[PDB]
Structure 1
Amino acid sequence: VRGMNTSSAMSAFERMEEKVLMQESRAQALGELAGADLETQFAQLEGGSDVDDELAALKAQMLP
């Protein structure tokens, strides 16, 4: 209960709880580094642009 050198529960948390979050943080950190490109932000614009340029065509073909 107090916390001995090799307490099964407490010692397990030291390596599990800590490392697990470390990897999780790395994913976000490394993931944000790969998403810093300015061309990826242009793709977002494309998506919004593509849905409005096709809409007109879609509405034009469906009209008749």
Structure 2
Amino acid sequence: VRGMNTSSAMSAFERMEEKVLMQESRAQALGELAGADLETQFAQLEGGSDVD
């Protein structure tokens, strides 16, 4: 309850959150870097021209 050194629930939460946060943030951040390209924003305008 007080959280001795290897209290299985608390220790597991720590180890999972290390993976969980790093992976998810990497994917969002690298996804925004891959999506940063100006020509891709031009592809949204192109999709507008194409549908019209």
Q: CA RMSD in A?
A: 0.8
Q: Quick one: percent identity of the two aligned structures?
A: 100
Q: How many residues align?
A: 51
**TM (normalized to structure 2)?**
0.89
Q: Which runs of 5 or more residues in structure 2 are unaligned? A: none
Higher relative contact order (CA 8 A, sep 6+): 2
Q: Which runs of 5 or more residues in structure 1 are unaligned? A: 52-64
**TM (normalized to structure 1)?**
0.74
Report the structure number with the largest CA radius of gyration.
1
Deviant stretches of 4+, over 4 Å: none
